[PDB]
Amino acid sequence: ATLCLGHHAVPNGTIVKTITNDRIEVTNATELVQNSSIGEICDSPHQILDGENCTLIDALLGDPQCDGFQNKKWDLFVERSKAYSNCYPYDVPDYASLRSLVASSGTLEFKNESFNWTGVTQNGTSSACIRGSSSSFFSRLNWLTHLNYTYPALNVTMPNKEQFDKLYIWGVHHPGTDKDQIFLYAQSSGRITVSTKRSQQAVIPNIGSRPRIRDIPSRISIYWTIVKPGDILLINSTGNLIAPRGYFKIRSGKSSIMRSDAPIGKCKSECITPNGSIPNDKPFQNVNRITYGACPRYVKHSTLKLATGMRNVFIENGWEGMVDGWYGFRHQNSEGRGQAADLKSTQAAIDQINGKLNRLIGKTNEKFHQIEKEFSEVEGRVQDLEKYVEDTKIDLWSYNAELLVALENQHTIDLTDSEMNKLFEKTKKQLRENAEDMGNGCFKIYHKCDNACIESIRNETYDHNVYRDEALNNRFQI
Amino acid sequence: ATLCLGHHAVPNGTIVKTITNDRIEVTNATELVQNSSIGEICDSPHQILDGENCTLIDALLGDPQCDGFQNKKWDLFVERSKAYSNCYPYDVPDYASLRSLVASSGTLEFKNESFNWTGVTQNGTSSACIRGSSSSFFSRLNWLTHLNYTYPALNVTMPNKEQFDKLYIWGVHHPGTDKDQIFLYAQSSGRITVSTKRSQQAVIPNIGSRPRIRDIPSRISIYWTIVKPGDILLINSTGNLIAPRGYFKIRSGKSSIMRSDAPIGKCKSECITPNGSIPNDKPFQNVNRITYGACPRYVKHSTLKLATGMRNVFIENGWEGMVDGWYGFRHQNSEGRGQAADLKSTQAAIDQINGKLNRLIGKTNEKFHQIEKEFSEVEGRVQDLEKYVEDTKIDLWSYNAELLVALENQHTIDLTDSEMNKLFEKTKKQLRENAEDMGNGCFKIYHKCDNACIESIRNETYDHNVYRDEALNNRFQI
Amino acid sequence: ATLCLGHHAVPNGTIVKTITNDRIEVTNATELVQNSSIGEICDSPHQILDGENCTLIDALLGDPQCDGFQNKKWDLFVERSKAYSNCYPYDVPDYASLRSLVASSGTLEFKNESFNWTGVTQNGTSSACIRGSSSSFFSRLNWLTHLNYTYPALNVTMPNKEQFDKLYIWGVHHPGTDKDQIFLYAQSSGRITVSTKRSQQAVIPNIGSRPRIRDIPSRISIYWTIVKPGDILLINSTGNLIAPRGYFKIRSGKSSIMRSDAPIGKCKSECITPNGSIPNDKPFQNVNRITYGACPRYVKHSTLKLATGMRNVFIENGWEGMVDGWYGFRHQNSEGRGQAADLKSTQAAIDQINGKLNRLIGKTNEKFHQIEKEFSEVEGRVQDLEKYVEDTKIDLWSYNAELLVALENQHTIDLTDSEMNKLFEKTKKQLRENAEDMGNGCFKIYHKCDNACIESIRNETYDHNVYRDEALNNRFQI
Ligand SMILES: *[C@@H]1O[C@H](CO)[C@@H](O[C@@H]2O[C@H](CO)[C@@H](O[C@@H]3O[C@H](CO)[C@@H](O)[C@H](O)[C@@H]3O)[C@H](O)[C@H]2NC(C)=O)[C@H](O)[C@H]1NC(C)=O
Ligand SMILES: *[C@@H]1O[C@H](CO)[C@@H](O[C@@H]2O[C@H](CO)[C@@H](O[C@@H]3O[C@H](CO)[C@@H](O)[C@H](O)[C@@H]3O)[C@H](O)[C@H]2NC(C)=O)[C@H](O)[C@H]1NC(C)=O
Ligand SMILES: *[C@@H]1O[C@H](CO)[C@@H](O[C@@H]2O[C@H](CO)[C@@H](O[C@@H]3O[C@H](CO)[C@@H](O)[C@H](O)[C@@H]3O)[C@H](O)[C@H]2NC(C)=O)[C@H](O)[C@H]1NC(C)=O
Ligand SMILES: *[C@@H]1O[C@H](CO)[C@@H](O[C@@H]2O[C@H](CO)[C@@H](O[C@@H]3O[C@H](CO)[C@@H](O)[C@H](O)[C@@H]3O)[C@H](O)[C@H]2NC(C)=O)[C@H](O)[C@H]1NC(C)=O
Ligand SMILES: *[C@@H]1O[C@H](CO)[C@@H](O[C@@H]2O[C@H](CO)[C@@H](O[C@@H]3O[C@H](CO)[C@@H](O)[C@H](O)[C@@H]3O)[C@H](O)[C@H]2NC(C)=O)[C@H](O)[C@H]1NC(C)=O
Ligand SMILES: *[C@@H]1O[C@H](CO)[C@@H](O[C@@H]2O[C@H](CO)[C@@H](O[C@@H]3O[C@H](CO)[C@@H](O)[C@H](O)[C@@H]3O)[C@H](O)[C@H]2NC(C)=O)[C@H](O)[C@H]1NC(C)=O
Ligand SMILES: *[C@@H]1O[C@H](CO)[C@@H](O[C@@H]2O[C@H](CO)[C@@H](O)[C@H](O)[C@H]2NC(C)=O)[C@H](O)[C@H]1NC(C)=O
Ligand SMILES: *[C@@H]1O[C@H](CO)[C@@H](O[C@@H]2O[C@H](CO)[C@@H](O)[C@H](O)[C@H]2NC(C)=O)[C@H](O)[C@H]1NC(C)=O
Ligand SMILES: *[C@@H]1O[C@H](CO)[C@@H](O[C@@H]2O[C@H](CO)[C@@H](O)[C@H](O)[C@H]2NC(C)=O)[C@H](O)[C@H]1NC(C)=O
Ligand SMILES: *[C@@H]1O[C@H](CO)[C@@H](O)[C@H](O)[C@H]1NC(C)=O
Ligand SMILES: *[C@@H]1O[C@H](CO)[C@@H](O)[C@H](O)[C@H]1NC(C)=O
Ligand SMILES: *[C@@H]1O[C@H](CO)[C@@H](O)[C@H](O)[C@H]1NC(C)=O
Ligand SMILES: *[C@@H]1O[C@H](CO)[C@@H](O)[C@H](O)[C@H]1NC(C)=O
Ligand SMILES: *[C@@H]1O[C@H](CO)[C@@H](O)[C@H](O)[C@H]1NC(C)=O
Ligand SMILES: *[C@@H]1O[C@H](CO)[C@@H](O)[C@H](O)[C@H]1NC(C)=O
Ligand SMILES: *[C@@H]1O[C@H](CO)[C@@H](O)[C@H](O)[C@H]1NC(C)=O
Ligand SMILES: *[C@@H]1O[C@H](CO)[C@@H](O)[C@H](O)[C@H]1NC(C)=O
Ligand SMILES: *[C@@H]1O[C@H](CO)[C@@H](O)[C@H](O)[C@H]1NC(C)=O
Ligand SMILES: *[C@@H]1O[C@H](CO)[C@@H](O)[C@H](O)[C@H]1NC(C)=O
Ligand SMILES: *[C@@H]1O[C@H](CO)[C@@H](O)[C@H](O)[C@H]1NC(C)=O
Ligand SMILES: *[C@@H]1O[C@H](CO)[C@@H](O)[C@H](O)[C@H]1NC(C)=O
Ligand SMILES: *[C@@H]1O[C@H](CO)[C@@H](O)[C@H](O)[C@H]1NC(C)=O
Ligand SMILES: *[C@@H]1O[C@H](CO)[C@@H](O)[C@H](O)[C@H]1NC(C)=O
Ligand SMILES: *[C@@H]1O[C@H](CO)[C@@H](O)[C@H](O)[C@H]1NC(C)=O
Ligand SMILES: *[C@@H]1O[C@H](CO)[C@@H](O)[C@H](O)[C@H]1NC(C)=O
Ligand SMILES: *[C@@H]1O[C@H](CO)[C@@H](O)[C@H](O)[C@H]1NC(C)=O
Ligand SMILES: *[C@@H]1O[C@H](CO)[C@@H](O)[C@H](O)[C@H]1NC(C)=O
Ligand SMILES: *[C@@H]1O[C@H](CO)[C@@H](O)[C@H](O)[C@H]1NC(C)=O
Ligand SMILES: *[C@@H]1O[C@H](CO)[C@@H](O)[C@H](O)[C@H]1NC(C)=O
Ligand SMILES: *[C@@H]1O[C@H](CO)[C@@H](O)[C@H](O)[C@H]1NC(C)=O
């Protein structure tokens, strides 16, 4: 009789890479790179505030078109590419840092304060910002002007007796001409100094014209300061002051701003990237560099294929007809032929493979408030450094992704081939003296074995001592 | 007779991770992460200067409480969290960069210079800083004031004829009111310009009040400049100048500032982290991100366990009673039973393992003057970038730490199992025709072997040709 | 008869490292680190502009010695260490960022514009810059001075109607004394404001002396601005303005500036580093950190050696006399002795090795406009961060380089040893019942085999069934 061992095969397998062969065919594989976003942003679990025609700093400052964004909270704020301001010409030095400061807070919560003013007009206004069909300037700021042709030195103090750091927004007027500096503040000049016990800032208005924006040559410049609990805010001004009306609370938490043109719909996802959510499963993605939340690592690879199967088609060609397992038996006897899979080695191969997959898939990390990655301006050294570090990070993670897959696939191939050899060796021991290894993965059995002993051999209940004499008479002619 | 091969076992082993199994039990393991500091900082080999109630910049500037820190040197300066200033209100633009500049120098060495002054008071003083029970301002600065109701334009030059870069510290007075600007400098204003052949700086005093600190509304602002050898320092001032009295030497070397609350005691260590020294041995640590000197890499893992043993409990269950080696023999003869370890395979397994440990343990790198990692203020973009790069570095090193251990443990397991198989195969050859492999790691010997031939087999001096006929008559009945 | 298997050997092999043994000897190896530059820079394929005695910013500004650099283009600009300026004392705030801005553009293309000036002298000049044996100042700038003892407020506009971002260079005069501020601009002071619809800048001249450079106490300060298409440039000035004469085009592409003292010759190379080109082949280099173009990664290792051979000198000592392959046969018969290599296993070992080499060698990445890595000044926090990230990048790539080689060499050794064992096992099957394994890698053949059957065994055409009876009579005496 003849008892053969072998393994299954697939008529059409797939291609994976390995550290030693570069291109090999395997029976089964799984992709590790998510290369497709939905095209829509999910509104759960993260809270998303959709800034339609409003940058975050316009909502912060107050703008007639952004009146719908007051005391809002978000985990993620979405800034649209179409946003434009619709108010008095605005200029913020280092606004990029202001934008970060109020992005990470997750909030536009604002509390008005009783700043005691006296001999100034406490309601300066402009036709630039139309609200309610009239002139209204910005909503969180107070443009002070002379009152009765005079502007007394304003020395006001607002102590911080609460447990919050307070963010104050204030600015300076740059009227554009001598004519207006006199008309508006009744002075040839002016100075603004703002201080705390920790730091001080000061500005000087700069008189001269600028290209007209919304028909206005003049501009407002915005500055900010933070008052720690126990400290006080002291404002010392002789003119051109656009006063705060109160403060914003500073918070620290899991929030940021993403710039993106995509609809926000009804879905659930833990990973958000500009052009929609990404399934939070495969360990790598190549959709974007900008992410929020729990996401796959970004790599430059287009694909990574991880074998879950075994090499396709000593042991003879894989059996395309094996369907009940991965490794198994085939036999010929005086009673004909048949096959059966070996479930013990099949299961071992499967669990070792699923173990490896479970260790990688679904394991992602959560990140917030990452540095800016894309730019619309040429800035110089800081920007060069930001680009540099981002590129460095990506090459290293791409490197790790490739090496890991190459090692995992090499392991997988060797992992399944050793199961085949263990099955072979085990069978040989059951038949220690009653069979010969024909060199092709089949054993020649020297007793006239029936189907029942084949079954016994397959389940390791075969007794080599009851066929010992028959086999010796057949093989050595004893 | 029967001769069995096997390996030792441990009644209670430990758990390690591998790249293929995640959780397995082994006989021996070693931790790779130092997760415990001493709680005390060592004063050797590194020289540590303990800044009690003094930040480095107060020692630099001069402060009655910091008089004990003059011309000091350090490899590491320790700044205490309780430090506070005890002098005239002080404000340094970009002090964080000044702090780095004089941190890396390792020194407060100072040399006074003969700046030729004329029609000014060359000893301005303040009640804010009490030294010797009187008014003394700061010790390295010279507050110049009017003399005889006049302040002539001070145009002084101090050439650099030495080989050192010279650091000059100087500042500008901001008196707080018009009243004092006249009283103190006899002028309505003032200007300060400082220049070299390489760069120029200028400031303008800003008059107005500030919250009173130590009962003083006025403040001093500090600026610095570096003069290269061959260049000169030119000071051009009309008032409000707080003049340098000389210069500090700039050096470059292996030094920094650490912020920490911990006692400095008597011990020796090459790795210093805020809360005490760390043994410089295990390749990774999870104590802190802030380190100085030769330290283990920081990882986010709590533990990493490296197998030094073999899988615990074909070859039958490991022998808990084996005590003289790792691999060995067990036998039964007509003369009874016994055991002996195989020292050749035992030693091979041990040396391969110790080789791997020696390659990793004790191999650390020395670092100095690293970027700041912790912050007490919200700064904007530079800070965001500093946090970003630190987090990136850590995830990558944590990744490498996990992968390395997973590979090392998988290797170790396969490494020791192959020794067992080599021993088995070798024994089989000694007994090539006189024995059968019973499939359980034991050989059936077909000659009536005594204890002396067992010893011969164990030491590879067995002659298969002298038992050949006895064995053939027993196994094939020839 | 006796048929032995073995492998070749080398009288003098080389040393490689492996993950398990640290130091082993192999027959063949290949270096992975290029540790030697040419000492000369190639002028192809990259276009190189050699700035002899000119920094890029001098060529940009215009300097009598840099008249040969107008409207030039480059992929790489080389700045020489000997460059010095030869013109009016020059000072550029944040010139390092200006230098980056015009470095990445790859060009000095300049177009003059018709700025409509009126009551000013439109040709201010200085003896500091001698061109054509006369006083000529800088070539791209226009020093405006009073004309007829007056300097009317200059409010000029230059709209951007093209598709290019335009770079304008302009500056402010700091005359050094009151005497000159009156002589030159007929005013006690002056102000300059420059603006667009996106941003604004302003400066105030600072009067006072500075160390004389080229006998001049006065200095020029340079500022720049970028005008986007559709915007306009508005210049508002009352004096001290050094006006632009036109604009430079801003481009974005594969270009940078390298600082290096090396001749540029005639060769071809894709990798440029300060001290000459580097062959673009080995995956790692340790020549420099500063690179341009397609280069090997920088590592701190001095050497990395990758085995291409097999372990040198069960299977007996390698055969130094094997010359026709790597694995082979040796035999003794009644007809004498001989040898032949096995080309099937030899070729398999070779292709697997060349596959691995092809996967690594020649695979490099192309980079442009990297951050500065070397410094000649102490700057504070930005510089500290730049150094920090560069060091981090290098340690991680050095780590990867070492681990990769250690794994590749371990693989290679196991890779070639398994071919030897496969050959052994295959031979045993051809001789399944007609031979014994003597335990030293040789088979004892029990039929009186001639040279012709040895050849048959070597080519797998041996019939074990025709010698079966002879062998059984000899080995079991049947
Ligand atoms: C910050 O606010 C305080 C308090 O209002 C200012 O102090 C006061 O400032 C005014 C205006 O400079 C002073 O009035 C002046 O009086 C002199 C003498 O008669 C006169 O010659 C000036 O033309 C002007 O009228 C006033 O004396 C002064 N003192 C107080 C406490 O009333 C302070 O100056 C402000 N700081 C800034 C930013 O300028
Ligand atoms: C400096 O020069 C600029 C550019 O010429 C001046 O800005 C421009 O001034 C003109 C008036 O001379 C403005 O035209 C006016 O526009 C308004 C609508 O905004 C219209 O109602 C008027 O009938 C008239 O057409 C022009 O818009 C304005 N903007 C630009 C940049 O073109 C600027 O005023 C000058 N500054 C001075 C003289 O100090
Ligand atoms: C830097 O120091 C130099 C040298 O002391 C200054 O030059 C001198 O500055 C003074 C004060 O501005 C000048 O005096 C002035 O004279 C004119 C004419 O009589 C008078 O109208 C002014 O009221 C004042 O008294 C002096 O002429 C001038 N020259 C020298 C060499 O003595 C320089 O101005 C200082 N720079 C700064 C920072 O202002
Ligand atoms: C601008 O307003 C602030 C806040 O009111 C003024 O600062 C404060 O001025 C008062 C006096 O009006 C100070 O009170 C005094 O304190 C000293 C001890 O430091 C004590 O000896 C006196 O008897 C009196 O109680 C107060 O300390 C001071 N500090 C703050 C921030 O509360 C500031 O002077 C005003 N600036 C002007 C008028 O220009
Ligand atoms: C930017 O350029 C514009 C246009 O040239 C300047 O506007 C003009 O500036 C001059 C000089 O300040 C003004 O002349 C002045 O007239 C008054 C009143 O007679 C006189 O008291 C002053 O002494 C001076 O002569 C002129 O009126 C003014 N307006 C125009 C459109 O002609 C603008 O001031 C410049 N901005 C800067 C940077 O100062
Ligand atoms: C402030 O002090 C500095 C240093 O003394 C003055 O700079 C120096 O001024 C002297 C003249 O007092 C210059 O000497 C002259 O040099 C020229 C050649 O450059 C020569 O032709 C003259 O015959 C004379 O020897 C000296 O070069 C100059 N430079 C330095 C830094 O030594 C500066 O002028 C003073 N500023 C004032 C008074 O405002
Ligand atoms: C953003 O602003 C633009 C301009 O105001 C809006 O476009 C207008 O939309 C309204 C209807 O809401 C139309 O009546 C106007 O005619 C449109 N003006 C044009 C042609 O620009 C746009 O809808 C706004 N989008 C939001 C709300 O984010
Ligand atoms: C830091 O400064 C504080 C305040 O001066 C010191 O605390 C004082 O210590 C002295 C003894 O040295 C006592 O007499 C005072 O009563 C303490 N004042 C209080 C209650 O704050 C502190 O010892 C200093 N620590 C050092 C030297 O670093
Ligand atoms: C850079 O500039 C220096 C100084 O002008 C040049 O050195 C001079 O070279 C010329 C010949 O071209 C000699 O006649 C002068 O005597 C040299 N002066 C000295 C001694 O410095 C140098 O050749 C220039 N190198 C270039 C062109 O990059
Ligand atoms: C992998 O095998 C499974 C059956 O176990 C099959 O459903 C799946 O489609 C296969 N995947 C590929 C891509 O071959
Ligand atoms: C990647 O793109 C291919 C082709 O569109 C698609 O079949 C595959 O599902 C994508 N991978 C994922 C899951 O993003
Ligand atoms: C703040 O605004 C609310 C608006 O309803 C008003 O009722 C309240 O009086 C204001 N308080 C202050 C401090 O101005
Ligand atoms: C505000 O300031 C004025 C100053 O005259 C004072 O009379 C008043 O009591 C202060 N308090 C108020 C009403 O806010
Ligand atoms: C300005 O107008 C607002 C309208 O809400 C009012 O509350 C505020 O008191 C006014 N301030 C003054 C006194 O001008
Ligand atoms: C989504 O992501 C980016 C844009 O944010 C871009 O590559 C592309 O539009 C989308 N898909 C791919 C290919 O990543
Ligand atoms: C294995 O199969 C044989 C078939 O003859 C049967 O006799 C024996 O009982 C079976 N043993 C097991 C494990 O069920
Ligand atoms: C490892 O084995 C050694 C004996 O060789 C023993 O002293 C040590 O405690 C063991 N370590 C562990 C943690 O099992
Ligand atoms: C880590 O912590 C555990 C529990 O306190 C301790 O047993 C172990 O020794 C620590 N590891 C080291 C050496 O830091
Ligand atoms: C510097 O200080 C020391 C203090 O002992 C003094 O002797 C010396 O004369 C001073 N020199 C200068 C340059 O002022
Ligand atoms: C210092 O300057 C004065 C200016 O009058 C001069 O007389 C003196 O010689 C100079 N030298 C000294 C004493 O430092
Ligand atoms: C200021 O006092 C110090 C005390 O040591 C003295 O050395 C210095 O010469 C004095 N300067 C002048 C002249 O005011
Ligand atoms: C020591 O290090 C840091 C504080 O610097 C902190 O995590 C903890 O207090 C200490 N131990 C640990 C758990 O790292
Ligand atoms: C090995 O042991 C046997 C025991 O009979 C002894 O005769 C022989 O000399 C020993 N050989 C060695 C290597 O000492
Ligand atoms: C490697 O072997 C080749 C022959 O195949 C030889 O030419 C080369 O010099 C060898 N390299 C080394 C360094 O041994
Ligand atoms: C490295 O240096 C050695 C010694 O000069 C040299 O033999 C070797 O070729 C160099 N490697 C390369 C190719 O740069
Ligand atoms: C620019 O310079 C060239 C030099 O040949 C001159 O012909 C042209 O007229 C100039 N154009 C302007 C706009 O000044
Ligand atoms: C330039 O400006 C003057 C201002 O008087 C004007 O007359 C002339 O037409 C303008 N155009 C030219 C010639 O550039
Ligand atoms: C300045 O001189 C240049 C020489 O090319 C000339 O083109 C320009 O028009 C002159 N400008 C004036 C009017 O001063
Ligand atoms: C070339 O590169 C750098 C200088 O840029 C320096 O290390 C050395 O001069 C050269 N060779 C080496 C050893 O890298
Ligand atoms: C192999 O060699 C033998 C030598 O006897 C020869 O008879 C046989 O034909 C050969 N077979 C092949 C593969 O050429």
Author numbering:
A (entry chain A), B (entry chain C), C (entry chain B): 25 to 337, 352 to 516
Q: How did the manuscript describe this experimental structure?
A:
To better understand the complex relationship between glycan organization on the HA surface and its potential impact on emerging strains, we characterized the structures and glycosylation profile of both HK/68 and Sing/16 by cryo-EM and mass-spectrometry. Notably, we obtained a structure of a fully glycosylated Sing/16 at 3.9 Å-resolution. We also solved the cryo-EM structure of Sing/16 produced in GnTI- cells, at 3.7Å-resolution and Sing/16 produced in HEK293T, at 3.9 Å-resolution. The two structures are highly similar with a Cα-root-mean-square deviation (rmsd) of 0.77 Å, suggesting the distribution of glycan types does not have a significant impact on the folded structure. The structure of Sing/16 revealed the prototypic trimeric structure of HA. The HA plasmids contain either one or two N-terminal superfolder green fluorescent protein (sfGFP) domains, for HK/68 and Sing/16, respectively. We observe density for core N-acetylglucosamine (GlcNac) moieties in our cryo-EM reconstructions at all PNGS on both HK/68 and Sing/16 except at N122, which is within a well-resolved region of the protein, and N8, which is near the N-terminus and is part of a poorly ordered region of the protein. Of the glycans detected, however, we found that HK/68 possessed on average 67% complex, 15% hybrid, and 16% high-mannose type glycans, while Sing/16 possessed 49% complex, 9% hybrid, and 28% high-mannose. We found that the accumulation of glycans on HA’s head domain has a dramatic effect on the epitope accessibility in the region, with an average 4.7-fold increase in GEF for Sing/16 over HK/68 for head domain residues. Our EMPEM analyses revealed that the fragment antigen binding domains (Fabs) of polyclonal antibodies complexed with matching proteins targeted the HA head in HK/68, head and vestigial esterase domain in NL/03, and vestigial esterase and stem domains in Sing/16.
